[PDB]
Structures are given as structure tokens and as C-alpha cells.
Design a protein around this ligand. Structure first.
Ligand SMILES: Cc1cc(C)c2[nH]ccc2c1CN1CCCC[C@H]1c1ccc(C(=O)O)cc1
Length: 287
């Protein structure tokens, strides 16, 4: 249960052993693939919108370690508050509030050099990972991980078993408001008279050109971990949920509005009661 560590100078899955690759079984435009994070021997954390609402369990395949093989999915647990149609009335055609889900594997993962768990917030694993005293509370972990500033973080993109680590900054200080307001640059979100209707307290915000030029996410990054890296340990603080510009299709638009091209991530500190409940038997030592 040594979480968030690399287990030589190897490649791809050796550097990011928690990454999980997800494919939609009956693909269409916008519903082709997603990412996830190994969080325990039986669980992969991802985004709820990666699944079909009906027969969730048979709607995706998931792989780890860069393997060809798909793992048997026993159950998919959606956060109970998630509803993509929740705000049609308000003219918001897709609502990503609470966009998290857990995949329960039928078989126990065997940890190795290419399959390892990432650390989750408010666990004893994260306390040990950050080398903090045993007096550490959930709130103190949040202060350590998400201070009120621009926070260096990272996420991972995959293509044909090739993983690419991209560095981003979480706008959690004086730029937070502006980060969130830029949701209005997303197609469909532009007519909505109050933007905090789309950007709820559940969301962290990355992207833009200040303080640095953050790379942006694509639809296929949905559900992958947003990670803070500290002294050789990796802690998940968010789940990639939605972006202002799909830069895998639409690099043109990002060059039009680069200062406002944001990505939005479900803040794991904001869904702790649910995480804690679903993962209570996983030996993660939730605080
Ligand atoms: C669901 C999703 C997930 C991830 C992780 C994403 N990352 C980047 C875009 C994105 C989306 C799509 N999105 C979600 C919010 C409404 C606007 C809509 C969109 C449609 C087309 C384009 C475009 O043509 O660029 C851009 C945005």
C-alpha cells in the first residue's frame, strides 16, 4: 500500500504505473475513449460521463499496465449526484457536476512495475507519501496539496500505448475567478446568464497562458487523474472532466482564445464522503 511511487529509467507505464486506458465498446463521435487511475487492487477511478447510463458494466473496456488484455468489470459506481441532463432547462446541454465514477474489478490487480496505485487525498497513504506527521488531518492535507495560489500539477495523455506527461497549473489563487469565468468560451455555455451555474464548487481549473503555457486536454483524457507531484511521490487531487477547447480536433480555436482555454477537473476533496464510503474496505486508511 505504498502509493504514488515508481517501482531503472524505464518508459511510459513504468513512469506512470497508475494510468488506466478505457475504450467505449460501441463508439461514436465524442464517446470513443477515456482514462482512469488505479486507486486500489479492485478499483479504477474515472469520470462518470465515460459510460452509457444503461448497462454501465458492459459499455467500456479497461486496461492497465499498457496490456492488450481487458479486465473483467464487476460493477460501476456513479457518484449519486451526477446527471448530464441536469440543467437542460437552463440551456446547459451537458452538466458535468459530480462527474466521477469507480470501476470495481472482479479480479484483484497484482501490483508490479507497470501497475501501481496512486495516492488519494485524506488517506494515511498520502500522509506517508508527503512525509507528514501522524497528527495530519484532512484539512492539513488540503493546505499542503491545494494552497491558495497557482499550483503546479500534471496530467497524462495516451496514444497507442505511448504516455505523455503534460504540466499544468491549477488556478487556486487570485486567478481562480477568471479561470472559472472562462467556461463561457466553451461551445454551448456562452448564452448562460450566470456561469457559476456550470462551474460548481466541485471543480478545479487549469489551462491558459499564465503563469505558463498550459497544454489542454482532449475528450479522450476524460477521467484521467490530475496529479500533484511532490518529492518523487504522486498524489491525485482531481479527475479530468471537461475542457473549453478540444485541441485534438480544434487547435485553431485555442489559437483564437489562448488566454481563456481552460480545463475543468472534479476536485477529489469535494467528493470525499462518497470516495470514503465506496472504498471503505480497500485498506486505504481514510482519515
Ligand atoms: C466532454 C469533453 C471532455 C474533455 C476532457 C474535453 N477536453 C476538451 C474539450 C472536452 C470536452 C467537450 N466539451 C465539454 C463542455 C461543453 C463544450 C464541449 C466542446 C465541444 C467541442 C469543442 C471543440 O470543437 O473544440 C470544445 C468543447
Amino acid at each position: 500500500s505504498l502509493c504514488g511511487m515508481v517501482w531503472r529509467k524505464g518508459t511510459d507505464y513504468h513512469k506512470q504505473p497508475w494510468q488506466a486506458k478505457i475504450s467505449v465498446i460501441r463508439p461514436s463521435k465524442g464517446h470513443e475513449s477515456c482514462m482512469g487511475a488505479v486507486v486500489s487492487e479492485y478499483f479504477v477511478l474515472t469520470a462518470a460521463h465515460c459510460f452509457t447510463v444503461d448497462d454501465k458494466e458492459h459499455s467500456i473496456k479497461v486496461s492497465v499496465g499498457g496490456e492488450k488484455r481487458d479486465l473483467e468489470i464487476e460493477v460501476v459506481l456513479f457518484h449519486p449526484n451526477y446527471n448530464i441532463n441536469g440543467k437542460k432547462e437552463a440551456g446547459i446541454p451537458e452538466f458535468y457536476d459530480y462527474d466521477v465514477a469507480l470501476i470495481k474489478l472482479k479480479n484483484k490487480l497484482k501490483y508490479g512495475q507497470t501497475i501501481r496505485p496512486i495516492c488519494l487525498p485524506c488517506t494515511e497513504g498520502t500522509t506517508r507519501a508527503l512525509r507528514l506527521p501522524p497528527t495530519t488531518t484532512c484539512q492539513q492535507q488540503k493546505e499542503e496539496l491545494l494552497p491558495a495560489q497557482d499550483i503546479k500539477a500534471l496530467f497524462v495523455s495516451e496514444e497507442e500505448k505511448k504516455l505523455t506527461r503534460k504540466e499544468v497549473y491549477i488556478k487556486n489563487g487570485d486567478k481562480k475567478g477568471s479561470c472559472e469565468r472562462d467556461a463561457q468560451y466553451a461551445p454551448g455555455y456562452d448564452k448562460v446568464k450566470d456561469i457559476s451555474e456550470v462551474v460548481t464548487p466541485r471543480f478545479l481549473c487549469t489551462g491558459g497562458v499564465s503563469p505558463y503555457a498550459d497544454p489542454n486536454t482532449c475528450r479522450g483524457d476524460s477521467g484521467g487523474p490530475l496529479i500533484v507531484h511532490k518529492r518523487s511521490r504522486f498524489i491525485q487531487v482531481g479527475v479530468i472532466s471537461w475542457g473549453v477547447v478540444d485541441v485534438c480536433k480544434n487547435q485553431k480555436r485555442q489559437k483564437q482564445v489562448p488566454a481563456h482555454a481552460r480545463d475543468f477537473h472534479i476536485n477529489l476533496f469535494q467528493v470525499l464522503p462518497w470516495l470514503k464510503e465506496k472504498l471503505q474496505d480497500e485498506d486505504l486508511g481514510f482519515l
